[PDB]
Curated annotation (Swiss-Prot):
This is Tyrosine-protein phosphatase non-receptor type 6. Phosphorylated on tyrosine residues. Binding of KITLG/SCF to KIT increases tyrosine phosphorylation. Phosphorylation at Thr-146 by TAOK3 leads to polyubiquitination and subsequent proteasomal degradation. Ubiquitinated after phosphorylation by TAOK3. Ubiquitinated by a cooperation between ITCH and WWP2 via 'Lys-27'-mediated polyubiquitin chains resulting in the reduction of its association with LCK. Residues 2-267 form the Tyrosine-protein phosphatase domain. Isoform 1 is expressed in hematopoietic cells. Isoform 2 is expressed in non-hematopoietic cells. One of its GO terms (biological process) is regulation of B cell differentiation. There is a cross-link at residue 66 (Glycyl lysine isopeptide (Lys-Gly) (interchain with G-Cter in ubiquitin)). The active site is at residue 205. It comes from Homo sapiens. Belongs to the protein-tyrosine phosphatase family. Non-receptor class 2 subfamily. The gene is PTPN6. The keyword Cell cycle does not apply. Substrate binds at residues 171, 205-211, 252.
Length: 279
């Protein structure tokens, strides 16, 4: 009786998998970069520590993404000034220890993301959290900032968060070679794997679907390969569709689509050459 009746209610939620009502509350209008790029209600990140008596207080334009054909991710839009505190609430509650920013703050005179970290050696509050930038390391393609975050009501409860910003991947194109992105993801994965208890990796660009979707799909495919071997079914189209069921529009452009193929092809060839050496 019960499970059959329950299944009859599971039906409605299946059909509702494409709704994006929360992002359309009038209270949330200033929290979106684009009125038409909204998180699916079913997978949206719901902010805690907020007053449920205030409509929209739980909102952020971001969704959980998991590899439903295999670690997990959050795909987020890039901060507006009005949403920087919301971003830090999200990172704290999810226990995220790695942030992956795939955009510059401004590209070609267009705002993409406001900075939500302090300069090195600076400490400041973002709502009820204190964030300190403890140091930076520059490579040719990306910058790593080590942030220390703690609740203002619990000052000694410190978490280190590693913030990786890719600097050479414009919203209007893709990198000329995939090597930079592949080594960037290798460092990110080494960091994440070193922390079994860490929450989802937070990945963002400007709208949170283009470069964000592209880098997440590359990472999931690399994971699949590293786990199953070079024998595995690599189905890029299927992987993208799976990720699109969780946040609308992930992997936006034809250049991004081709870049996934180019990145994975190089990853496979590099892997094969190393294995050839070991045998």
């Amino acid at each position: 009786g019960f499970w059959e009746e329950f299944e009859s209610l599971q039906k409605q939620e299946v059909k509702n998998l494409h709704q994006r009502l929360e992002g359309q509350r009038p209270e949330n209008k200033g929290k979106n970069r684009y009125k038409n790029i909204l998180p699916f209600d079913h997978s949206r990140v719901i902010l805690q520590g907020r007053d449920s008596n205030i409509p929209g207080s739980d909102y952020i334009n971001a969704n959980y993404i998991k590899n439903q054909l295999l670690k997990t991710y959050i795909a987020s839009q890039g901060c507006l000034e009005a949403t920087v505190n919301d971003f830090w609430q999200m990172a704290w509650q999810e226990n995220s220890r790695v942030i992956v920013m795939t955009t510059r703050e401004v590209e070609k005179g267009r705002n993409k993301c406001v900075p939500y970290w302090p300069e090195v050696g600076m400490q400041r509050a973002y709502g009820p959290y204190s964030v300190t930038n403890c140091g930076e390391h520059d490579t040719t393609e990306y910058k790593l900032r080590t942030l220390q975050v703690s609740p203002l009501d619990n000052g000694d409860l410190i978490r280190e968060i590693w913030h990786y910003q890719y600097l050479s991947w414009p919203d209007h194109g893709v990198p000329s070679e995939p090597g930079g992105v592949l080594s960037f993801l290798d460092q990110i994965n080494q960091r994440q794997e070193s922390l079994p208890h860490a929450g989802p990796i937070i990945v963002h660009c400007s709208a949170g679907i283009g470069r964000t979707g592209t880098i997440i799909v590359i990472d999931m495919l690399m994971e699949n390969i590293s786990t199953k071997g070079l024998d595995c079914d690599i189905d890029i189209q299927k992987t993208i569709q799976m990720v699109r069921a969780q946040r609308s529009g992930m992997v936006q452009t034809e250049a991004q689509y081709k870049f996934i193929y180019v990145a994975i092809a190089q990853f496979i060839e590099t892997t094969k050459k190393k294995l050839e050496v070991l045998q």
